[PDB]
From a paper:
Initiation of DNA synthesis during DNA replication relies on a specialised DNA-dependent RNA polymerase, known as primase. In archaea and eukarya, primase is a constitutive heterodimer of a catalytic subunit, [name] or Pri1, and a regulatory subunit, [name] or Pri27. We have shown that PriX has replaced the Fe–S cluster domain of [name] as the primase module responsible for endowing primase with the ability to initiate nucleic acid synthesis.
To test this hypothesis, we designed and prepared a heterodimeric version of the [name] primase (named Chimera), which contained wild-type [name] and a second subunit where amino acids 1 to 211 of [name] were fused to amino acids 42 to 154 of PriX, thus excluding the [name]-CTD. The experiments showed that Chimera was able to prime levels of DNA synthesis that were comparable to those of wild-type [name], thus confirming the results of the primase assay. Interestingly, the crystal structure of Chimera shows that covalently-linked PriX occupies a similar but not identical position relative to PriX in the [name] structure, possibly representing an intermediate point in a putative PriX trajectory between initiation and extension states. The cross-linking experiment was performed for both [name] and Chimera, yielding equivalent results, in further support of Chimera’s recapitulation of the behavior of wild-type [name]. Primer initiation assay showed no primer synthesis by the cross-linked Chimera, in support of the view that the [name] conformation, as seen in the crystal structure, is not compatible with primer initiation. However, RNA primer extension assays using either NTP or dNTP did show primer elongation, indicating that the crystal structure of [name] represents a biochemically active and potentially physiologically relevant conformation. The fact that the cross-linked Chimera was exclusively active in the extension, but not initiation, of an RNA primer, points to the conformation of the crystal structure as representing a ‘polymerase’ mode.
Residue numbers in the entry:
A (entry chain B): 3 to 208
B (entry chain A): 11 to 329
C (entry chain C): 56 to 154
Write the structure that this text describes.
C-alpha cells in the first residue's frame, strides 16, 4: 500500500514527526513558498474542469494533500469544497482500478466500510454474455447507507442479496470507496474552522 | 340497544390480546362504534389498563397500536413524541389481486342502485363485497413469496397475521438499526420485494441467490400495498382483536399451510336471527349461502355477525 | 452576506412558503451554510409549519434539497426578488420590518 499514491494513510501529525518535533503544518507553510502554490494548483484546476494530477508527482505528497484541505477550509466555499471532493475522489478511481484485491480491502477498513470477503458466487447473464462473479459482501443496512448519494444503478433491486448481505464485485467495491473518499473529505473540513491560524497565513492563501 | 356492540363488548372482556413487550412506548388508536373519527394519542402501560378502557370507556370497532416507539406516546406535537424507531411492515391487499363480486343496493326496496341514495326511499345505499376463499388462496401465495424474500434475502424473522378481512400482514419486529431506516430506505426494500427495479435474469439457475434464482423459478414480484412499507409511522392492527368489517380475529398464522378461511376465525358462538336485505347466492366464509329478502333465517353467530358487518342485512336477536 | 435568510427561517411566512424554499431557503442551507442533507430537511419543515395553514410532505422537500445539490444553485438576492416575484418581496420585508 503505497503512501505516495494514497496520502490519507499518514495522518497530518504523523508526517510532521520527520522534522524532529513541534514543527506544525503552520510552521512549514509560513516558510515554504511553494507548498501553497501546489495546493492552489489543484484548487484552480478543479474550477476549470481539468483533471487532478496523481500524488506521485509531488515531492511531499502527504503535505500537499493536507495543505489543500486546509486551503479549502479558509476559502469556506461550500460549492468549491464539494466540487473538490468529486474531482479528488475521481483522481483516486484511476489509481484504484490498478490495485490488487488485498489492498482494496485495506483501504475500506481505514474508511470504516464494513466489507469483507466471502465464498465467490458465480452466475450467468444474457445481456452481458459473461460469467459474473461476486466475491465481496456488505450488509444491506450498511449498503443502503453507503449508496445514499449515488445513482439508480446502486438501487437494492439490481443487486444480489443473500441472508442480509449484498454481494459486490471488484468494480462495485471501487465504486463505494470513491463515494467514501468524497464523503470523508466533506467531513474532514467541517472541524477545520477551529485553530485560529496566524492572520498573515490567511492572507497568503487569499 | 346495539346488538353488535354487546358481542364485541363480551369478547374484549375475556379475550387476551397479543401486545408487544415495549407496550408503554407505543401510541394506541381505535375507531369507536357509530363514528368515523379516530381516537388516538392514547397511552397504556399494561393489558389490564387497556382492557379497562375498551370495556368501560370506548369500545373499539377497530383497534390499532403504532408501529413506532415513542418516549412520549400521548403527545400531539410530532417532535414532542420523540420518535425512536419503528418496525418494518408489509400489507398484502386483495384490491389488486382477485377483484371480487360487488353489489350496491338500497336496504329498503332491495333494488340495485348505483347512486349514493335510492331515489324512492331517500336512504343511503349499501355495498357488499363478496370475499371468497379462492381470493384468500391467491393472497396466500404472495405472503409465502414475501416471507421467502424476507428470510432468504434479508435474514429477517417475520411474523404472519390474518388481516381480519381481505388480506394478510407481515411484521418484522426489529430493535437495532433495522428500526431506524428512513422512509426512502424502506422504499428501496419495498420496490425490491415488488420487483420494480429488479431486471429479468433470463438465463440463471434455479439455485442462484437473490432474484436471479427466483426469477427463473417462475416467481415475479410480490403484490403489496407499498404505502404501508414507506410510512415510518403506521398503526398496526392489534393481533387477537376484532375487525370492524367482518368481526373476525386477527389471528397470527404460525404455518401458512394449515390456514383455513371458515367460521373458526370468528369467536362468537350461539345462533342469531338474521334479516337479509337482498336475495343473493353468495359464498360466505368458505360455503355458499342463499338468503331471501325480508325472510328471517337462523344461522350461527359466526356467520350472522359477518354478514351484518358487510351490510348484507341485520342481526335481530341472539339465541 | 446572507443574514436575512436566517431571519425569515426563524420567524416564518404566510403566502409564498414554497417559492421561498425553492429559490432561496433550500439553496442557502445546502450550498452556503453547508448543513447535512437530512439536517436541512428538519430545518425547512419547521419553517413551513409556522402559520400551519397548509401541509408540506417530505417528498417535495427532499426533491428540492437533492435538486440544488446537483445543479449547484445559490440563493436569490433581495434585488433579484424585486425583479421576479414582487409578491414575495413584500412578504419578506414585512418579516424584516418586524425587527
Ligand atoms: Zn330504495
Amino acid at each position: 500500500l503505497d503512501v505516495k499514491k494514497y496520502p490519507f494513510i499518514k495522518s497530518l501529525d504523523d508526517e510532521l514527526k520527520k522534522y524532529g518535533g513541534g514543527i506544525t503544518l503552520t510552521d512549514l507553510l509560513l516558510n515554504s513558498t511553494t507548498l501553497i502554490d501546489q495546493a492552489k494548483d489543484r484548487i484552480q484546476k478543479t474550477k476549470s474542469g481539468d483533471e487532478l494530477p496523481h500524488y506521485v508527482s509531488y515531492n511531499e505528497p502527504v503535505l500537499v494533500f493536507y495543505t489543500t484541505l486546509l486551503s479549502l477550509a479558509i476559502l469556506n466555499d461550500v460549492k468549491l469544497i464539494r466540487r473538490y471532493a468529486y474531482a479528488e475522489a475521481k483522481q483516486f478511481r484511476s489509481l484504484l482500478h490498478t490495485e490488487n484485491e488485498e489492498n482494496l480491502l485495506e483501504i475500506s477498513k481505514l474508511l470504516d466500510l464494513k466489507i469483507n470477503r466471502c465464498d465467490p458466487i458465480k452466475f450467468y447473464l444474457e445481456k452481458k454474455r459473461r460469467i459474473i462473479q461476486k466475491e465481496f459482501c456488505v450488509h444491506f443496512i450498511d449498503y443502503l447507507k453507503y449508496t445514499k448519494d449515488l445513482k439508480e444503478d446502486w438501487k437494492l433491486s439490481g443487486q444480489i442479496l443473500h441472508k442480509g448481505y449484498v454481494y459486490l464485485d471488484k468494480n462495485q467495491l471501487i465504486g463505494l470507496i470513491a463515494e467514501s473518499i468524497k464523503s470523508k473529505i466533506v467531513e474532514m473540513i467541517r472541524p477545520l474552522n477551529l485553530k485560529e491560524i496566524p492572520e498573515k497565513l490567511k492572507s497568503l492563501i487569499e | 340497544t346495539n346488538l353488535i356492540k354487546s358481542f364485541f363488548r363480551n369478547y374484549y372482556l375475556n379475550a387476551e390480546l397479543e401486545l408487544p413487550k415495549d407496550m408503554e412506548l407505543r401510541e394506541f388508536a381505535l375507531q369507536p362504534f357509530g363514528s368515523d373519527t379516530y381516537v388516538r394519542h392514547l397511552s397504556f402501560s399494561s393489558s389490564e389498563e387497556l382492557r379497562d378502557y375498551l370495556v368501560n370507556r370506548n369500545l373499539p370497532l377497530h383497534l390499532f397500536y403504532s408501529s413506532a416507539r415513542y418516549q412520549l406516546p400521548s403527545a400531539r406535537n410530532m417532535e414532542e413524541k420523540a420518535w425512536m424507531g419503528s418496525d418494518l411492515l408489509f400489507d398484502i391487499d386483495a384490491d389488486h389481486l382477485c377483484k371480487l363480486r360487488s353489489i350496491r343496493f338500497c336496504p329498503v326496496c332491495g333494488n340495485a342502485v348505483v347512486s349514493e341514495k335510492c331515489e324512492r326511499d331517500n336512504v343511503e345505499t349499501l355495498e357488499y363485497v363478496e370475499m371468497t376463499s379462492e381470493c384468500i388462496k391467491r393472497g396466500l401465495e404472495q405472503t409465502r413469496n414475501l416471507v421467502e424474500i424476507l428470510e432468504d434475502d434479508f435474514g429477517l424473522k417475520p411474523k404472519v397475521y390474518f388481516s381480519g378481512n381481505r388480506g394478510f400482514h407481515v411484521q418484522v419486529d426489529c430493535y437495532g438499526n433495522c428500526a431506524l431506516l428512513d422512509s426512502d430506505e424502506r422504499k428501496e426494500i419495498a420496490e425490491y420485494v415488488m420487483g420494480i427495479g429488479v431486471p429479468g435474469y433470463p438465463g440463471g439457475s434455479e439455485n442462484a441467490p437473490g432474484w436471479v434464482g427466483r426469477k427463473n423459478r417462475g416467481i415475479n414480484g410480490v403484490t403489496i400495498d407499498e404505502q404501508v412499507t414507506i410510512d415510518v409511522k403506521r398503526l398496526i392492527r392489534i393481533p387477537n382483536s376484532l375487525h370492524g368489517k367482518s368481526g373476525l380475529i386477527v389471528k397470527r398464522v404460525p404455518n401458512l399451510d394449515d390456514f383455513e378461511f371458515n367460521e373458526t376465525l370468528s369467536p362468537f358462538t350461539g345462533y342469531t336471527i338474521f334479516l337479509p336485505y337482498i336475495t343473493i347466492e353468495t359464498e360466505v366464509l368458505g360455503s355458499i349461502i342463499k338468503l331471501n329478502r325480508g325472510i328471517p333465517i337462523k344461522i350461527k353467530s359466526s356467520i350472522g355477525i359477518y354478514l351484518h358487518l358487510r351490510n348484507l342485512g341485520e342481526v335481530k336477536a341472539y339465541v
